[PDB]
Every structure is written in C-alpha cells, then in structure tokens.
Amino acid sequence: ATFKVTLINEAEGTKHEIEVPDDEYILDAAEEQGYDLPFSCRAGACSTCAGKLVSGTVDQSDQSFLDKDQIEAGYVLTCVAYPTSDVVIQTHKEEDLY
C-alpha cells in the first residue's frame, strides 16, 4: 500500500502532500519527493525530527527517544516512522518537547 502524507509547517503556513510506501520511513520519502526536513541522528534517538500527528496512524516501533506520554500526545520521530494509514502531520515540533 502507498499512503498519502500531508506535511504541515504551521509557522510557515505551508502544506505539502507526499505519497509514502508502507515500508518506507516518512522522512526518506519526503526527501525523495523534494522536501528537506529537519534531522540529526536519523536513528530514532533524538528529537530533531519530531512531528505531531493531526490524523492517521504510524508505526514507529523503532524509536527510542519519546516516552509513552509523548507518544500518547501524538508525537512522532519522522526519521523512523512508517505510515499505517493516510496521515496528517505537523513538522518542526522539536521545541514542544521537554
């Protein structure tokens, strides 16, 4: 399956739509399609690539930085997240983390 991923940059007021395979991380697909997104470690262990789910689900089982409450709040590390449905996500949310 291939899912539609809508990327929202609130501060910029931008909206970009990408198509993501069920077996590719969102960050990788975004880059391939022309959208550079923030990142550092690329391994699920930092907060640089943090995003926030608006709608849809992901599989980020490979992540290790976010605690259970943060996940519950909708936080996602884009570098190791697979979409599991069409998704709407706000990018550049690193600052929201404490």
Ligand code: FES
């Ligand atoms: S870039 Fe570090 S967790 Fe994604």
